């Protein structure tokens, strides 16, 4: 949780994932509103659903060569984990 609730440009790292994630696809996250102060608790909110939900974590291969460890939902919804378990980003 350290990674994605580090501090950054007036939010934080899973709170701007989260903002242009729901910038792009509303339908998938829902739409983000009100003080940047918030987007790290609505952020955290979809992170915590996406862990408990069924389906799994897979390690998964880029075309570059880079490695992560990613959970998708049916929803459309997922994130996406460095190998080390820290916070990458959401996916979709």
């Not at 998938?28 to 408990?52: C, L, P, T």
């Not at 490695?67 to 996406?80: A, C, H, M, Q, S």
């Amino acid at each position: 949780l350290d990674t994605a609730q580090a501090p950054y440009k007036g939010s934080t790292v899973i709170g701007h994932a989260l903002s242009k994630h729901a910038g792009r696809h509303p339908e998938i996250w829902g739409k983000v509103k009100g003080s940047m102060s918030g987007w790290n608790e609505q952020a955290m909110k979809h992170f915590k659903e996406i862990v408990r939900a069924p389906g799994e974590f897979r390690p998964t291969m880029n075309e570059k060569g880079i490695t992560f460890l990613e959970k998708r939902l049916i929803d459309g919804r997922g994130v996406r984990l460095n190998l080390d378990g820290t916070f990458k980003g959401f996916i979709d």
